[PDB]
Point group: D2
Chain length 443, copies 4
């Protein structure tokens, strides 16, 4: 209780609980199918938003009131944050965290310097790690903040930058393997363009592919076993980011033979910024077999930039979780809270309140989706809707016995064709009924 | 001059011309590189917007004043339109048109009936064709208007509909081959979803692929030589259309081994509705080697639906044409005016005025792009910008002599890395200078 | 049971009900504060979407399967629809309907003709009305469908059209007064522009104002007592509609002295299309004292056009209803279901299913908002948040005792200023708790 | 040449000029109607973007290479910037600049401290001012950057903040009057909301109005003669900003009796972010008689946040300038370049290149608009389009001799009504012709 003395370890208080520092729906311990609820959800904290971020926006200064802000020595701060991390996870009941290499340790004048400094904090992280139960869900290299990357990393126009980026990723892969990460994420924040006038699209996409596979070859050369995750985003900071979305990123991987090595880390706000719903992007990832992990936030659909808010909407969490359950639940991934407090929610307790809200909403949603999937209510409607492809000519079609000519013959004279209603208004009311059903079974 | 007696054949009148029924920039005959300008641009009329469409919008009745509207007998109208088509192209100087099978001939009670009726008009089209110089750029089947397709065509939930759709496409391929079309287009207008709740995404995408290849196999079985074009659109009428954009459609083709057979027909308004610029979508198509053809319109970026306006913006036409020239110009495609007059531009002369405006804008843009490409002004800046990948470690990288380890070695101690400016503000002013340059060389 | 023989009168079946033709949350009879629930909500059917509309979209033909479609004589159909209206309301338990003058009766060759034809159906409506309990919530003139209005009605460039529009509105006001309407709505569907190039903005806004007040003067001259409602919409069909939103329309009214006579009919989908949330638009209307009535639908935030879906989202209905309750509930207005079935929900039962879903969602939302308002949970937080304006200099400010000079004096030396957290993450979790609370008290 | 030794004073080099540090269209000295071109345009630099801003974006560190960055003492930097300002304006040929109070001088621990520090730099600004020809177009107080304003300034929930804000504005008004500013701008950057849950909309709007008028009363008490400008913005940083746009802000002013004292400073990117075109917002301001000044930038319509780019599009500059000319040109306002270089355009020469590009584009646009307005080409079409309101019943309507009854009489039997085409496709081609015309008359 050194850092956040006023915050106690958080416990479950049930559906009617009134205390803001209590879980209303998330019972970490509750077992479902022989697994405690915590092992279904695999909640994780994002080091960047929670410990580094201080409420600065394009028009304003940082607002956050954080304990480690007294330490003015960059290294004291870096260490203070590592300690706060573990205390935070302990009280909030979390067992996973994610970080960028540049989140944990300040940079030196050279890469060598930088790496040395980096090792210092990594070692401290490992001590507190084994003393605790928190683990590394995934690690990643920040290839977008430093001016060096203004024209991109792998897609830069400067070979020196390409080299630096390859070296940084190398280190990042190393410390991730050392800390036992389940995955390694690629967010191409500057891998895109601001204008086509100065962009050799084809060249940049080639270098990007060379980079990706150099990374997969080195992962082999060091016996790294984590899952490689690509995190799509349509834009911001760039005008167009290359991994625009699942389908686009897939197209690039498949196109260059890199797909077998990658899965996707889908973020709600990224999905909606590309004009897709969160569910859509999850389903796509799923049928491709690459639903890797999830960054659990929530954007504002009436705003054109990532708001990165804590998820407080049961409709979204339900449809999201429905996809995960149908994919078979998580393997080497989970619900990393890539979200942040509103600038005005600047008090330390708001960090806690925010994370609790997200966990409750996702927990409840998981439970609603669990019923939907168990009763099989949606799966039956769908099975009935595409019924004709099981009987008659339908099956001939699917099996491949038919061609255009045989289809013309079959259909040439048929006058009226019978069609099912879509029932959308009905299905939606159903989601409401299951929300009500589940709430009634809540403790 | 039977249909549009008040409109004379349109001729070039030069840059300072004042008459709205005159080309100011488009000189059909002007030869560039041994080809008249008309053979670079390959302008084409869209039968649907020009002859069938009458200004109806979701909130209002049709407004168009068209000659063929006296004929109340559906067939008289169908024939009246075929005649107007050729007169229109003659006066407006156009040599290509595109049509949907359901644009040219009313439907019967059965497919057989429908096909018979269809043959009647196709024959009349062929007579007037050989008597004229207009040709079929591409044909396509309307698989979205008739209620039968409310749940899609290839992605329908009813095998009967799948069959009907296969049969209709079969006929469409036939009459396209007969009329000598350069290509056959697929617009999946209803090939998408309105809700995921009733959608088996994976199944629909499978049937879609079966369909596409049945179509390519039958194209073989009839010695059809036209290019198969897929026309991407992100949405409308659907919430999500499967061929969302170039990259997405590519991903699906490549994923199912259908890519070698297809190229893309890119439409400005579709590009921008998916959150892309027209140029972006053209460049993508280009580096994939599938810049097939273009539907030349212009959307309104502040409106969320296809406005389908005539292109009157030289910046857009310049960047668009720049991509075509760099792709090597058209082969089996061209600038089909998939655009329509504003509801209030309901007079017959507005049809002409609209098409002239689009042709001028595209002609001028072609000329600006032609200079940009000739002076090689942009290509030099780009060649200089990625220079480091030719010298030193840069080339080692590209050639594949380097790995992460060797890159770490090279970069481990480098303190400062030198970067070029992006020059975006400069490049943009350049586009302005070339617009001014070209205008000064205009007759 | 003549028209919809297969549909029985709908009754309440409770929260756990499974039957799609049953209310789960809406108990018409349940009394709250001495009023049955039906008198709080005042649900109403929209004649246009339910009886006239048949599922036609810009890319497709109508799909709806409706009983009255056998009658091919326009008048038989017009009468068949009036009968269906009352049967529909009876079974679905609704007591109000809204209509456009052009929804109920086909048009003649002249206004005189048209009015005669109109009287025929109005009389039939009045008979079945007194035989039933359904009433007219509000009436309105369709000033956008007929080609005559392509350039607007009051904002047209043709004085003849202005005249026709004034005459049509006159008739509309008359039959509304005759049928006992509670209000008369103005939707300026064509009162806007598609381009500024041909628009004399100032003139059109002047004629619009002349029109509005001619209408208020004639309402006096006939002793009409209904509330005049303006229904804002940012666009569609126009590029820009003049009554863009509450604030904009207010600005125009206030600017021309017409505000005292009008209130607003707020539509969810219109609010969100203008970049506002439904709640925002309701609150604005409320503090202006002009929260007149509501068109209860739900748009799709990822689509740029009115989807006009049935409301199935409890978050929206809760925040919406919260505003109504705080405004004091309805007076001369209610929840008109200006929504329509999805094109694929083409069966008659879907009309019922759709309306039931909307009513349930709005009923439940009303109940959640009712608790929020009763416990006063939000009002207390707000009272505490702006506390400093009650004590000290705060009150001096509000009362007007202070000026800049006195404020400079008070503040010139104050070093640190204490600020409250915004608690957004907290407040949102609260809305979730009240949804859960209310569901537990549900029968 | 101390700060930017490598940049010479910029001169006009004409339409065919190739040198990026030369004006191609902007000839400062060229007289039009007895005024040099510089007095029509009144170009101005924004202190914030040019001197303070360094290319930092939400995902990245600052990139800018600026001379004054060696000075690590905050005050040395503050003074270094004032010197650079005047050198910049001299070389770039600019005679006006705009600044925020917090742009020019670092803040102290108390307001008193802060004001003292502020006076130091203001005095240095005044010396170099009288030694030069640059003037203050407008000044403004930064009421959004400092944490104190996280809940707003005038709309804050803390009376202390309200007081501080009133005091800061007081000082700002003072130094603006001292430096001879033509206007004083209000940008309510934090005057809006992020959530309605914690917002007493009515109260905040009341305090906002109290504030505005306290400001107008003190402007009187000090004999300030500059024009008060309100600068609308729909959002960012807030979810909803109160002065959403011209009409909304107008509504609030008019509603509280503050309108007679204010005019609008319209910004392109703000207009388009609210779903309006730049021209639309200018026309509105114009017919209200409050087209005060312009912030000349250009947003990216496919991005949902302010990009604040330098204007390089002649279509936009033409329609914008067309409105200014029609308003009668500038009085106490001008074209302040509230724009910034792309992050990658980090070299000092790019600052110059960017500003030159904007000035050329606006100069050329001014010239195109000047012809449009002189030939009166658009005004004639419009005069002809609304012709019927001059003759017959049309005039009776406008003059107010008509009512609904007389209009019913006039129109009751009229069968067909004749309507003009809208000619949009024609008018747009015209804008192209005038762009070509003007370019040919360019030196
Ligand atoms: Co400690
Ligand atoms: Co994100
Ligand atoms: Co993320
Ligand atoms: Co003839
Ligand atoms: Co289209
Ligand atoms: Co098209
Ligand atoms: Co009957
Ligand atoms: Co609507
Ligand atoms: Co409505
Ligand atoms: Co010096
Ligand atoms: Co701005
Ligand atoms: Co500004």
């Amino acid at each position: 209780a050194e850092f956040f003395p006023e915050i106690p370890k958080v416990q479950f208080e049930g559906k009617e609980s009134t205390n803001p520092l209590a879980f209303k729906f998330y019972d970490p311990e509750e077992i479902i199918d022989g697994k405690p609820l915590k092992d279904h959800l695999k909640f994780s904290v994002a080091f960047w938003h929670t410990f580094v971020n201080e409420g600065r926006d394009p028009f304003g200064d940082p607002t956050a009131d954080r304990p480690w802000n007294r330490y003015t020595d960059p290294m004291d701060k870096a260490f203070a944050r590592v300690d706060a991390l573990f205390e935070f996870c302990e009280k909030l009941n979390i067992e996973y965290f994610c970080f960028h290499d540049r989140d944990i340790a300040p940079e030196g004048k050279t890469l060598r310097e930088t790496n040395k400094i980096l090792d210092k904090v990594v070692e401290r992280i490992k001590e507190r790690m084994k003393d605790s139960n928190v683990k590394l869900l995934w690690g990643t290299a920040n290839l977008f903040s430093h001016p060096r990357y203004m024209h991109g990393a792998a897609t830069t126009c400067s070979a020196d930058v390409f080299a630096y980026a390859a070296a940084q990723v190398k280190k990042a892969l190393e410390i991730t393997k050392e800390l036992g990460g389940e995955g390694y994420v690629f967010w191409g924040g500057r891998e895109g363009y601001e204008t086509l006038l100065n962009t050799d699209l084809g060249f940049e996409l080639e270098n990007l592919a060379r980079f990706l596979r150099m990374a997969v070859d080195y992962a082999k050369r060091i016996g790294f076993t984590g899952q490689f995750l690509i995190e799509p985003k349509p834009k911001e900071p760039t005008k167009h980011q290359y991994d625009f979305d699942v389908a686009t990123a897939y197209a690039f991987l498949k196109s260059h033979g890199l797909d077998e090595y990658f899965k996707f880390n889908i973020e709600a706000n990224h999905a909606t910024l590309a004009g897709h719903t969160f569910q859509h992007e999850l389903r796509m990832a799923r049928i491709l077999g690459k639903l890797g992990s999830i960054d659990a936030n929530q954007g504002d659909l009436l705003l054109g930039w990532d708001t990165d808010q804590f998820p407080t909407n049961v409709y979204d969490t339900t449809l999201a979780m429905y996809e995960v359950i149908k994919a078979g639940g998580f393997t080497k991934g989970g619900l990393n809270f890539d979200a942040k407090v509103r600038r005005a929610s600047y008090k330390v307790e708001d960090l806690f309140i925010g994370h609790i809200a997200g966990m409750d909403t996702f927990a409840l949603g998981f439970k609603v989706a669990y019923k939907l999937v168990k009763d099989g209510v949606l799966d039956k409607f769908i099975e009935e809707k595409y019924r004709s492809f099981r009987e008659g000519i339908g099956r001939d079609i699917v099996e491949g016995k038919v061609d255009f000519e045989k289809l013309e013959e079959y259909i040439i004279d048929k006058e009226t064709i019978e069609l099912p209603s879509g029932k959308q208004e009905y299905l939606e009311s159903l989601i409401n009924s299951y929300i009500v059903k589940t709430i009634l079974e809540l403790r």
